[PDB]
RNA sequence: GUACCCCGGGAGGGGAGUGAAAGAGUUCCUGAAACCGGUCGCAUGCAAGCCGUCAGAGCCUGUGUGGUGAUGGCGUGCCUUUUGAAGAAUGAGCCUGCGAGUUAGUGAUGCGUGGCGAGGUUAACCCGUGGUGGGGGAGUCGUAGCGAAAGCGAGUCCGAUA
RNA sequence: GGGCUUAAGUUAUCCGCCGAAGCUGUGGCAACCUGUGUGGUUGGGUAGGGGAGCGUCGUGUCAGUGGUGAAGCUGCCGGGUGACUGUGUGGUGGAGUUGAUGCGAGUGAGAAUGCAGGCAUGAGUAGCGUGUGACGGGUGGGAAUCCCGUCCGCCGAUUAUC
């Protein structure tokens, strides 16, 4: 099949506006010495650590 | 008739208000794909925006992040503002030069390919201007 | 320049009609006229200037001839074999409000404003209505000589 | 002035593509007039614009043009301009003494009236003519005519009843 | 003397695009599409400037009918009564009286009632 | 042909300089339309819309006119081709540019207009190296028609000087 | 269509009204006729005939005008019966050009499955051309897709060599 007619501006924009992305949320690193933003349930790219203020196990050597 | 108060980007975007801006011209990516991230980053605090764009999965995040950082530096240098009290007042993506290329297809046909490009503009002002 | 009403300029009132032994056609024409406000010198087609109509005793609406069992009302769900039909007598017995609303809507223009105005018609099959707070005034269907 | 027609534009000999099957419009040559770079349909071609006006008409017109400012007193006659050797300063004076500066001079003497001719040649508000070339255009354009004595005599001798 | 068309051509295009400066979609952006709607717009405006007489007369007649029926008199009898009484106040002034000066309209209704043939 | 400084790996931009002008920065004069966006005003999630038009509230603005437009009426595109097309007949995705009644003949035939007028007019060519002016009447049309023609002539031809 | 016999049905008859761009009233425009103080008649229109014009470009002449800002482009405020326009007022722009009156046209575009360029629509959609890669380390602004290594897999009358 082929598009019979050129789609109107209103309809094209109605469909196109739904092509979007949500913002990444980010969470503050539990390490007091780092305090950076990292993905939830993900090792902090700055400190390379994971876990609550206590645990704090190293995950990434960075 | 040409004369004084000649138009300028600063005059058009800020108009005697404090703040600065930055333009990335001829970004070798599509304007729509840049807008997909511009819409998210518009209106945010500048530091929050750049930290988020370090994690945004789209490829448009990197050029937009660099533009925001450049605008932040321009503001810090030319108006004494601090990076932590700036917010992205404006942000938009216009279309730049497009290159026509050829992709060969079946039965000897050639299909047009458009390599698009974008201009990214970000305007940062002190957060006190948000309620003004 | 001819006068034109301004939104809430015309004050809308509440009438109540006892459909006791009143022909469905006369009741529907009177209701449509009242709902659209055609009896007011301030009438305007584009601004709702009509009044609210509360119809009581809709289950005792009079029908002439053999209408009560031969005058049919049809609905279609939009799918094959989706027709239902019921006689106006059965509809007055079961859901008199639907019958009166169908008659009045048929007699009223086919408009978005007419759809809005049809909501002002409150039809009850019994002799009692719950709109005592709105204080409806009795309305008598009459004719003007010559 | 000239333009190239579709037959004179270079190339365009063959049919650009098949008549049918391509989905394109039927074309016969790439130099067809509706094509960019194609021939011009009805563009200019070299020609002459000369009109064969009757002798009586041309002469009479000349007579009327001369007569209008004869009645308006715009014809002066001088024995000559300049003496001995020839300057432009001298005649500029002779004519300014005559009147104004939108001038016609007649000196007729087609072979050796170099003194007057070369004197008045460079004024740029003087038009110099031989009496046998008065012509209506120049007479009408002139605000005054000054004849040399010989110029007027030769014009009258060339045409008189 | 080759002549370039653009300077003369753009004038009608600017005129039409200005005339079509509230239209939806291509009808306000594209000259050819705006031109088609301006033909329809002109036809509709000419037709409606003549239908406006009837529309406003109908509105006046409806308002007069309502106001006179409030006095127990139909519009036809009211107009016949005014015609017989010889009062040539027209549908327009009568409607304005009905909306604004209801007492004067009611006095006219009484005049029409008295001037009725009563037959 | 943008020293130097700042963000940037760069690209690019921000300051600053050059210049009358840099939103003339080399993709460089002017910089239109389609097309793509940011911002602001109004409308819009009970509605059936050839998209307009007439009536018309509200809001915004008042740069006191403009923007928007709830709601009511009326209302089936453009072109081509057709007895007849909104047509489910043809062509057109869109804008910008381009794209079709021209020119040549001392052609044919009208008309308008100008000149001359029982006359009108030159062609080639010659002179004017100074042109658009002058010459050139060879020709050509008008000046008598009728007849196949000899011929005759306000007549002629058919005919018998009918 | 709603609904209508309690006619809002049929029929005879009477009294009113509604109803068109028809008629009349009022204001403006135009063609023609007529004696020329009046007035009369007329003005839907395809093919098509006649008449009168607008705008663009070039150009003779006269009057000019232009860095105290031409052309072009683009707002606003106006004007004409139309094509159109202002000797109104800004913005952009940077070198030409206006009025009168003639003269000459490559003189007007929405259509030709027209030509050239630019750009939308479909759409962030289909596809990304047979397949097996994994990991450690390195380089780097940036690494699944580069380098090194180790495992693993593939070809082997060929995925080798000439
Ligand atoms: Mg949809
Ligand atoms: Mg200007
Ligand atoms: Mg091949
Ligand atoms: Mg050829
Ligand atoms: Mg051929
Ligand atoms: Mg060529
Ligand atoms: Mg009515
Ligand atoms: Mg200067
Ligand atoms: Mg500029
Ligand atoms: Mg460019
Ligand atoms: Mg430029
Ligand atoms: Mg709603
Ligand atoms: Mg419908
Ligand atoms: Mg047929
Ligand atoms: Mg079609
Ligand atoms: Mg269709
Ligand atoms: Mg066909
Ligand atoms: Mg097609
Ligand atoms: Mg085309
Ligand atoms: Mg001879
Ligand atoms: Mg009428
Ligand atoms: Mg009429
Ligand atoms: Mg009249
Ligand atoms: Mg006519
Ligand atoms: Mg008529
Ligand atoms: Mg015609
Ligand atoms: Mg000057
Ligand atoms: Mg010019
Ligand atoms: Mg002129
Ligand atoms: Mg042309
Ligand atoms: Mg075009
Ligand atoms: Mg095609
Ligand atoms: Mg093309
Ligand atoms: Mg697209
Ligand atoms: Mg997807
Ligand atoms: Mg799809
Ligand atoms: Mg898919
Ligand atoms: Mg896929
Ligand atoms: Mg593969
Ligand atoms: Mg691979
Ligand atoms: Mg390896
Ligand atoms: Mg193997
Ligand atoms: Mg083997
Ligand atoms: Zn951390």
Tab-separated table of C-alpha atoms in Angstrom, chain A residues 8-54:
chain	number	residue	atom	x	y	z
A	8	UNK	CA	-1.926	17.368	6.997
A	9	UNK	CA	0.289	19.366	9.323
A	10	UNK	CA	-2.053	18.777	12.262
A	11	UNK	CA	-2.109	14.994	11.873
A	12	UNK	CA	1.605	14.721	11.126
A	13	UNK	CA	2.397	16.709	14.257
A	14	UNK	CA	-0.103	14.731	16.338
A	15	UNK	CA	1.732	11.538	15.431
A	16	UNK	CA	5.245	13.000	15.574
A	17	UNK	CA	4.863	14.567	19.025
A	18	UNK	CA	4.626	11.072	20.523
A	19	UNK	CA	8.194	10.245	19.441
A	20	UNK	CA	9.938	11.319	22.625
A	21	UNK	CA	12.036	10.072	25.524
A	22	UNK	CA	11.793	10.399	29.282
A	23	UNK	CA	14.544	12.013	31.313
A	24	UNK	CA	16.968	9.767	33.154
A	25	UNK	CA	16.153	10.028	36.838
A	26	UNK	CA	19.522	9.779	38.667
A	27	UNK	CA	20.074	9.300	42.408
A	28	UNK	CA	22.564	10.860	44.811
A	29	UNK	CA	25.470	8.597	45.739
A	30	UNK	CA	25.177	7.294	49.290
A	31	UNK	CA	28.924	7.731	49.799
A	32	UNK	CA	29.407	11.009	51.718
A	33	UNK	CA	32.831	11.453	50.111
A	34	UNK	CA	31.264	11.241	46.628
A	35	UNK	CA	27.782	12.781	46.693
A	36	UNK	CA	27.505	12.390	42.923
A	37	UNK	CA	24.518	11.393	40.804
A	38	UNK	CA	24.280	7.834	39.498
A	39	UNK	CA	21.641	5.526	38.090
A	40	UNK	CA	19.467	3.726	40.660
A	41	UNK	CA	20.601	0.174	41.427
A	42	UNK	CA	23.840	0.943	39.590
A	43	UNK	CA	27.409	1.485	40.745
A	44	UNK	CA	28.413	5.128	40.986
A	45	UNK	CA	30.604	5.989	37.966
A	46	UNK	CA	32.591	8.464	40.070
A	47	UNK	CA	33.325	6.568	43.285
A	48	UNK	CA	32.853	3.138	41.712
A	49	UNK	CA	30.939	1.929	44.755
A	50	UNK	CA	27.585	0.408	45.597
A	51	UNK	CA	25.453	-0.026	48.682
A	52	UNK	CA	24.200	2.121	51.549
A	53	UNK	CA	26.390	4.495	53.581
A	54	UNK	CA	27.538	1.483	55.659
